[PDB]
Amino acid sequence: NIINTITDGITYANRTEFFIRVMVLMMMDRKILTMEFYDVDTSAISNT
Amino acid sequence: PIYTSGLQKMQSSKVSMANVVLSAGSDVIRQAAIKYNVVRTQEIILFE
């Protein structure tokens, strides 16, 4: 129910309205990422 | 019914008694029955 369709199934209209919802979400959702950190050694670590 | 070799028993305009009769048997009135299967190809509305 954003796009009426003459069928009782899982037709394309599902994919379409799914697009619509996530699109209007990403229109909104202004977020800023902030975070703290640990501090570890670097000589006692295998990967560089 | 024709005669023995005469023309026809409906031309002489003279009645006869002993001509020949068809007969059927017990059950010659079996009503008949047919049946059909229907399935349609293209609906009226359609297409996701």
mmCIF file of N, CA and C in Angstrom:
data_model
loop_
_atom_site.group_PDB
_atom_site.id
_atom_site.type_symbol
_atom_site.label_atom_id
_atom_site.label_comp_id
_atom_site.label_asym_id
_atom_site.label_seq_id
_atom_site.Cartn_x
_atom_site.Cartn_y
_atom_site.Cartn_z
ATOM 1 N N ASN A 1 0.845 -1.178 0.000
ATOM 2 C CA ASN A 1 0.000 0.000 0.000
ATOM 3 C C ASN A 1 0.889 1.239 0.000
ATOM 4 N N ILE A 2 1.509 1.505 -1.146
ATOM 5 C CA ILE A 2 1.841 2.844 -1.612
ATOM 6 C C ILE A 2 1.503 2.829 -3.092
ATOM 7 N N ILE A 3 1.455 1.627 -3.655
ATOM 8 C CA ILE A 3 1.251 1.430 -5.082
ATOM 9 C C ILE A 3 0.270 0.289 -5.273
ATOM 10 N N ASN A 4 -0.985 0.627 -5.526
ATOM 11 C CA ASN A 4 -1.989 -0.388 -5.781
ATOM 12 C C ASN A 4 -1.582 -1.264 -6.955
ATOM 13 N N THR A 5 -1.972 -2.531 -6.892
ATOM 14 C CA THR A 5 -1.644 -3.495 -7.925
ATOM 15 C C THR A 5 -2.716 -4.568 -7.986
ATOM 16 N N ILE A 6 -3.064 -4.958 -9.208
ATOM 17 C CA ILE A 6 -4.073 -5.985 -9.431
ATOM 18 C C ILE A 6 -3.331 -7.316 -9.457
ATOM 19 N N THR A 7 -3.077 -7.853 -8.268
ATOM 20 C CA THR A 7 -2.580 -9.207 -8.062
ATOM 21 C C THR A 7 -2.437 -9.424 -6.566
ATOM 22 N N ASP A 8 -2.422 -10.689 -6.170
ATOM 23 C CA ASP A 8 -2.179 -11.076 -4.788
ATOM 24 C C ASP A 8 -0.893 -11.894 -4.776
ATOM 25 N N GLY A 9 0.222 -11.199 -4.700
ATOM 26 C CA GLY A 9 1.497 -11.864 -4.767
ATOM 27 C C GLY A 9 2.597 -10.995 -4.239
ATOM 28 N N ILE A 10 3.814 -11.317 -4.651
ATOM 29 C CA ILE A 10 4.983 -10.612 -4.155
ATOM 30 C C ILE A 10 5.598 -9.874 -5.333
ATOM 31 N N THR A 11 4.745 -9.388 -6.227
ATOM 32 C CA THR A 11 5.183 -8.811 -7.485
ATOM 33 C C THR A 11 6.101 -7.609 -7.281
ATOM 34 N N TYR A 12 6.662 -7.157 -8.401
ATOM 35 C CA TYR A 12 7.597 -6.043 -8.487
ATOM 36 C C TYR A 12 7.239 -4.878 -7.582
ATOM 37 N N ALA A 13 5.942 -4.592 -7.463
ATOM 38 C CA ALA A 13 5.498 -3.469 -6.652
ATOM 39 C C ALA A 13 6.097 -3.514 -5.260
ATOM 40 N N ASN A 14 6.334 -4.713 -4.737
ATOM 41 C CA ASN A 14 7.047 -4.838 -3.477
ATOM 42 C C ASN A 14 8.407 -4.172 -3.554
ATOM 43 N N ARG A 15 9.215 -4.576 -4.530
ATOM 44 C CA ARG A 15 10.525 -3.968 -4.707
ATOM 45 C C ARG A 15 10.411 -2.461 -4.862
ATOM 46 N N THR A 16 9.391 -2.001 -5.579
ATOM 47 C CA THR A 16 9.280 -0.574 -5.851
ATOM 48 C C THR A 16 9.008 0.213 -4.577
ATOM 49 N N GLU A 17 8.010 -0.208 -3.806
ATOM 50 C CA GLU A 17 7.703 0.523 -2.588
ATOM 51 C C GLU A 17 8.845 0.397 -1.594
ATOM 52 N N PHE A 18 9.548 -0.731 -1.630
ATOM 53 C CA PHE A 18 10.731 -0.866 -0.802
ATOM 54 C C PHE A 18 11.752 0.195 -1.157
ATOM 55 N N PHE A 19 11.943 0.442 -2.449
ATOM 56 C CA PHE A 19 12.826 1.526 -2.859
ATOM 57 C C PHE A 19 12.344 2.844 -2.283
ATOM 58 N N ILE A 20 11.048 3.100 -2.395
ATOM 59 C CA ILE A 20 10.502 4.393 -2.008
ATOM 60 C C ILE A 20 10.800 4.663 -0.545
ATOM 61 N N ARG A 21 10.585 3.658 0.294
ATOM 62 C CA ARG A 21 10.739 3.870 1.727
ATOM 63 C C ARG A 21 12.183 4.200 2.084
ATOM 64 N N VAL A 22 13.129 3.396 1.603
ATOM 65 C CA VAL A 22 14.520 3.637 1.963
ATOM 66 C C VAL A 22 15.005 4.942 1.366
ATOM 67 N N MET A 23 14.477 5.314 0.205
ATOM 68 C CA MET A 23 14.858 6.577 -0.401
ATOM 69 C C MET A 23 14.417 7.743 0.464
ATOM 70 N N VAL A 24 13.159 7.733 0.904
ATOM 71 C CA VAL A 24 12.710 8.844 1.724
ATOM 72 C C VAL A 24 13.373 8.810 3.092
ATOM 73 N N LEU A 25 13.828 7.645 3.548
ATOM 74 C CA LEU A 25 14.636 7.624 4.762
ATOM 75 C C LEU A 25 15.950 8.361 4.548
ATOM 76 N N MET A 26 16.678 8.008 3.493
ATOM 77 C CA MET A 26 17.963 8.643 3.240
ATOM 78 C C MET A 26 17.824 10.118 2.897
ATOM 79 N N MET A 27 16.650 10.553 2.445
ATOM 80 C CA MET A 27 16.407 11.984 2.335
ATOM 81 C C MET A 27 16.566 12.657 3.686
ATOM 82 N N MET A 28 15.943 12.085 4.704
ATOM 83 C CA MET A 28 16.171 12.427 6.096
ATOM 84 C C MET A 28 17.455 11.749 6.541
ATOM 85 N N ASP A 29 17.615 11.567 7.849
ATOM 86 C CA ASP A 29 18.769 10.879 8.417
ATOM 87 C C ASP A 29 20.032 11.678 8.175
ATOM 88 N N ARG A 30 20.049 12.889 8.697
ATOM 89 C CA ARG A 30 21.262 13.673 8.808
ATOM 90 C C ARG A 30 21.881 13.328 10.150
ATOM 91 N N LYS A 31 22.930 12.520 10.133
ATOM 92 C CA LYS A 31 23.616 12.134 11.350
ATOM 93 C C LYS A 31 25.083 12.502 11.244
ATOM 94 N N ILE A 32 25.716 12.671 12.398
ATOM 95 C CA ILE A 32 27.149 12.915 12.464
ATOM 96 C C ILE A 32 27.764 11.857 13.357
ATOM 97 N N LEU A 33 28.850 11.263 12.897
ATOM 98 C CA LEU A 33 29.508 10.190 13.617
ATOM 99 C C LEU A 33 30.571 10.786 14.522
ATOM 100 N N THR A 34 30.459 10.532 15.816
ATOM 101 C CA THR A 34 31.492 10.912 16.761
ATOM 102 C C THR A 34 31.820 9.712 17.632
ATOM 103 N N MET A 35 33.070 9.628 18.070
ATOM 104 C CA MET A 35 33.505 8.458 18.813
ATOM 105 C C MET A 35 34.855 8.734 19.445
ATOM 106 N N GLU A 36 35.125 8.036 20.539
ATOM 107 C CA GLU A 36 36.423 8.048 21.193
ATOM 108 C C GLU A 36 37.230 6.829 20.769
ATOM 109 N N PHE A 37 38.454 6.741 21.278
ATOM 110 C CA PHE A 37 39.347 5.679 20.850
ATOM 111 C C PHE A 37 40.156 5.177 22.028
ATOM 112 N N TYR A 38 40.562 3.919 21.936
ATOM 113 C CA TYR A 38 41.604 3.394 22.802
ATOM 114 C C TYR A 38 42.948 3.836 22.247
ATOM 115 N N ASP A 39 44.020 3.390 22.888
ATOM 116 C CA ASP A 39 45.362 3.599 22.368
ATOM 117 C C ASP A 39 46.172 2.360 22.695
ATOM 118 N N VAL A 40 46.661 1.681 21.667
ATOM 119 C CA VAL A 40 47.283 0.383 21.820
ATOM 120 C C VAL A 40 48.731 0.480 21.363
ATOM 121 N N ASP A 41 49.476 -0.595 21.593
ATOM 122 C CA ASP A 41 50.831 -0.689 21.089
ATOM 123 C C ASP A 41 50.811 -0.937 19.583
ATOM 124 N N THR A 42 51.958 -0.724 18.948
ATOM 125 C CA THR A 42 52.109 -1.039 17.537
ATOM 126 C C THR A 42 53.267 -1.971 17.237
ATOM 127 N N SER A 43 54.235 -2.118 18.136
ATOM 128 C CA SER A 43 55.306 -3.077 17.909
ATOM 129 C C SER A 43 54.865 -4.493 18.244
ATOM 130 N N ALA A 44 54.006 -4.650 19.245
ATOM 131 C CA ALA A 44 53.471 -5.961 19.596
ATOM 132 C C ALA A 44 52.172 -6.240 18.855
ATOM 133 N N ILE A 45 52.198 -6.041 17.540
ATOM 134 C CA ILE A 45 51.057 -6.317 16.680
ATOM 135 C C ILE A 45 51.587 -6.853 15.365
ATOM 136 N N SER A 46 51.010 -7.964 14.924
ATOM 137 C CA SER A 46 51.469 -8.632 13.718
ATOM 138 C C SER A 46 51.183 -7.803 12.477
ATOM 139 N N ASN A 47 49.908 -7.550 12.211
ATOM 140 C CA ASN A 47 49.535 -6.758 11.051
ATOM 141 C C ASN A 47 50.106 -5.356 11.160
ATOM 142 N N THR A 48 50.606 -4.843 10.047
ATOM 143 C CA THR A 48 51.063 -3.464 9.993
ATOM 144 C C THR A 48 49.964 -2.502 9.597
ATOM 145 N N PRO B 1 -42.759 -48.243 -46.293
ATOM 146 C CA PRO B 1 -42.863 -49.634 -46.737
ATOM 147 C C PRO B 1 -43.313 -49.758 -48.177
ATOM 148 N N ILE B 2 -42.493 -50.412 -48.989
ATOM 149 C CA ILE B 2 -42.827 -50.748 -50.364
ATOM 150 C C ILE B 2 -43.605 -52.055 -50.380
ATOM 151 N N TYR B 3 -44.139 -52.414 -51.538
ATOM 152 C CA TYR B 3 -44.867 -53.654 -51.761
ATOM 153 C C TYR B 3 -43.885 -54.823 -51.782
ATOM 154 N N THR B 4 -44.277 -55.934 -52.401
ATOM 155 C CA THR B 4 -43.296 -56.956 -52.740
ATOM 156 C C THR B 4 -42.405 -56.488 -53.882
ATOM 157 N N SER B 5 -43.011 -56.093 -54.997
ATOM 158 C CA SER B 5 -42.280 -55.444 -56.074
ATOM 159 C C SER B 5 -43.078 -54.296 -56.667
ATOM 160 N N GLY B 6 -44.240 -53.981 -56.110
ATOM 161 C CA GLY B 6 -45.019 -52.862 -56.585
ATOM 162 C C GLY B 6 -44.344 -51.534 -56.332
ATOM 163 N N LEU B 7 -45.000 -50.457 -56.746
ATOM 164 C CA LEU B 7 -44.404 -49.135 -56.667
ATOM 165 C C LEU B 7 -44.111 -48.743 -55.231
ATOM 166 N N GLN B 8 -45.164 -48.533 -54.451
ATOM 167 C CA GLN B 8 -45.024 -47.972 -53.117
ATOM 168 C C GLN B 8 -46.365 -48.024 -52.406
ATOM 169 N N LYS B 9 -46.370 -48.297 -51.108
ATOM 170 C CA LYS B 9 -47.639 -48.468 -50.420
ATOM 171 C C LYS B 9 -48.241 -47.130 -50.037
ATOM 172 N N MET B 10 -47.827 -46.067 -50.709
ATOM 173 C CA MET B 10 -48.424 -44.760 -50.498
ATOM 174 C C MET B 10 -48.702 -44.085 -51.824
ATOM 175 N N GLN B 11 -49.040 -44.877 -52.834
ATOM 176 C CA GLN B 11 -49.409 -44.318 -54.122
ATOM 177 C C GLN B 11 -50.732 -44.896 -54.589
ATOM 178 N N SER B 12 -50.966 -46.171 -54.295
ATOM 179 C CA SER B 12 -52.192 -46.810 -54.750
ATOM 180 C C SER B 12 -53.425 -46.274 -54.046
ATOM 181 N N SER B 13 -53.257 -45.519 -52.965
ATOM 182 C CA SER B 13 -54.379 -45.028 -52.176
ATOM 183 C C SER B 13 -55.304 -46.173 -51.784
ATOM 184 N N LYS B 14 -54.704 -47.332 -51.531
ATOM 185 C CA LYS B 14 -55.440 -48.513 -51.102
ATOM 186 C C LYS B 14 -54.785 -49.050 -49.844
ATOM 187 N N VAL B 15 -55.573 -49.194 -48.783
ATOM 188 C CA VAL B 15 -55.009 -49.534 -47.490
ATOM 189 C C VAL B 15 -54.479 -50.963 -47.495
ATOM 190 N N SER B 16 -53.461 -51.209 -46.671
ATOM 191 C CA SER B 16 -52.891 -52.540 -46.489
ATOM 192 C C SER B 16 -52.771 -52.799 -45.000
ATOM 193 N N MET B 17 -52.735 -54.073 -44.610
ATOM 194 C CA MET B 17 -52.750 -54.414 -43.194
ATOM 195 C C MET B 17 -51.421 -54.913 -42.652
ATOM 196 N N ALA B 18 -50.662 -55.694 -43.406
ATOM 197 C CA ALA B 18 -49.640 -56.522 -42.788
ATOM 198 C C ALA B 18 -48.224 -56.061 -43.074
ATOM 199 N N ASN B 19 -48.001 -54.767 -43.232
ATOM 200 C CA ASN B 19 -46.661 -54.306 -43.543
ATOM 201 C C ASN B 19 -45.756 -54.428 -42.327
ATOM 202 N N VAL B 20 -44.525 -53.945 -42.472
ATOM 203 C CA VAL B 20 -43.470 -54.276 -41.529
ATOM 204 C C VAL B 20 -43.126 -53.082 -40.648
ATOM 205 N N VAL B 21 -42.822 -53.358 -39.382
ATOM 206 C CA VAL B 21 -42.697 -52.340 -38.348
ATOM 207 C C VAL B 21 -41.324 -52.430 -37.705
ATOM 208 N N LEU B 22 -40.691 -51.279 -37.494
ATOM 209 C CA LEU B 22 -39.455 -51.247 -36.730
ATOM 210 C C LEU B 22 -39.755 -51.251 -35.234
ATOM 211 N N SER B 23 -38.811 -51.767 -34.455
ATOM 212 C CA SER B 23 -38.940 -51.780 -33.008
ATOM 213 C C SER B 23 -37.583 -51.494 -32.405
ATOM 214 N N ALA B 24 -37.581 -51.024 -31.166
ATOM 215 C CA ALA B 24 -36.361 -50.488 -30.587
ATOM 216 C C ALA B 24 -35.762 -51.365 -29.503
ATOM 217 N N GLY B 25 -36.501 -51.643 -28.453
ATOM 218 C CA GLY B 25 -35.940 -52.306 -27.303
ATOM 219 C C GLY B 25 -36.274 -51.539 -26.053
ATOM 220 N N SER B 26 -35.630 -51.918 -24.951
ATOM 221 C CA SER B 26 -36.026 -51.379 -23.656
ATOM 222 C C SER B 26 -35.688 -49.903 -23.529
ATOM 223 N N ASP B 27 -34.433 -49.544 -23.765
ATOM 224 C CA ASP B 27 -33.923 -48.232 -23.383
ATOM 225 C C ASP B 27 -33.183 -47.616 -24.559
ATOM 226 N N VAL B 28 -33.858 -46.750 -25.300
ATOM 227 C CA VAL B 28 -33.219 -46.109 -26.438
ATOM 228 C C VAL B 28 -33.310 -44.610 -26.199
ATOM 229 N N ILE B 29 -33.613 -44.230 -24.964
ATOM 230 C CA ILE B 29 -33.847 -42.837 -24.623
ATOM 231 C C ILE B 29 -32.784 -42.318 -23.656
ATOM 232 N N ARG B 30 -31.613 -42.936 -23.641
ATOM 233 C CA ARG B 30 -30.531 -42.414 -22.824
ATOM 234 C C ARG B 30 -30.196 -40.995 -23.241
ATOM 235 N N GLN B 31 -30.463 -40.040 -22.355
ATOM 236 C CA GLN B 31 -30.106 -38.659 -22.631
ATOM 237 C C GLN B 31 -28.591 -38.529 -22.746
ATOM 238 N N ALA B 32 -28.140 -37.517 -23.479
ATOM 239 C CA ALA B 32 -26.713 -37.421 -23.746
ATOM 240 C C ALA B 32 -26.090 -36.341 -22.881
ATOM 241 N N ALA B 33 -24.774 -36.415 -22.732
ATOM 242 C CA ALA B 33 -24.091 -35.485 -21.849
ATOM 243 C C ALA B 33 -22.705 -35.195 -22.387
ATOM 244 N N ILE B 34 -22.322 -33.926 -22.378
ATOM 245 C CA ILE B 34 -20.973 -33.533 -22.739
ATOM 246 C C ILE B 34 -20.437 -32.656 -21.623
ATOM 247 N N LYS B 35 -19.145 -32.376 -21.681
ATOM 248 C CA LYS B 35 -18.551 -31.546 -20.653
ATOM 249 C C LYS B 35 -17.408 -30.769 -21.265
ATOM 250 N N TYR B 36 -17.163 -29.579 -20.735
ATOM 251 C CA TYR B 36 -16.065 -28.773 -21.235
ATOM 252 C C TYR B 36 -15.185 -28.290 -20.097
ATOM 253 N N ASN B 37 -13.908 -28.151 -20.416
ATOM 254 C CA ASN B 37 -12.929 -27.545 -19.536
ATOM 255 C C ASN B 37 -12.556 -26.180 -20.078
ATOM 256 N N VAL B 38 -12.513 -25.206 -19.184
ATOM 257 C CA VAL B 38 -12.205 -23.829 -19.522
ATOM 258 C C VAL B 38 -10.978 -23.408 -18.737
ATOM 259 N N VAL B 39 -10.069 -22.722 -19.432
ATOM 260 C CA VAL B 39 -8.983 -21.991 -18.791
ATOM 261 C C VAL B 39 -8.568 -20.847 -19.702
ATOM 262 N N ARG B 40 -8.415 -19.659 -19.133
ATOM 263 C CA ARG B 40 -8.191 -18.456 -19.921
ATOM 264 C C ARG B 40 -6.725 -18.060 -19.908
ATOM 265 N N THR B 41 -6.286 -17.453 -21.008
ATOM 266 C CA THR B 41 -4.877 -17.124 -21.180
ATOM 267 C C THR B 41 -4.549 -15.732 -20.658
ATOM 268 N N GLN B 42 -5.181 -14.705 -21.209
ATOM 269 C CA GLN B 42 -4.879 -13.331 -20.842
ATOM 270 C C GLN B 42 -6.007 -12.771 -19.995
ATOM 271 N N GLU B 43 -5.680 -12.356 -18.781
ATOM 272 C CA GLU B 43 -6.666 -11.735 -17.917
ATOM 273 C C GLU B 43 -7.038 -10.364 -18.464
ATOM 274 N N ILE B 44 -7.912 -9.666 -17.743
ATOM 275 C CA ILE B 44 -8.332 -8.351 -18.205
ATOM 276 C C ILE B 44 -7.353 -7.277 -17.755
ATOM 277 N N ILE B 45 -6.966 -7.282 -16.483
ATOM 278 C CA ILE B 45 -5.938 -6.371 -15.998
ATOM 279 C C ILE B 45 -4.690 -7.191 -15.723
ATOM 280 N N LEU B 46 -3.538 -6.534 -15.579
ATOM 281 C CA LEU B 46 -2.298 -7.293 -15.451
ATOM 282 C C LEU B 46 -1.086 -6.452 -15.059
ATOM 283 N N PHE B 47 0.312 -7.025 -15.098
ATOM 284 C CA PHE B 47 1.578 -6.314 -15.235
ATOM 285 C C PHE B 47 2.081 -5.589 -13.991
ATOM 286 N N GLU B 48 2.372 -6.330 -12.921
ATOM 287 C CA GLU B 48 3.014 -5.797 -11.704
ATOM 288 C C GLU B 48 2.404 -4.482 -11.236
#
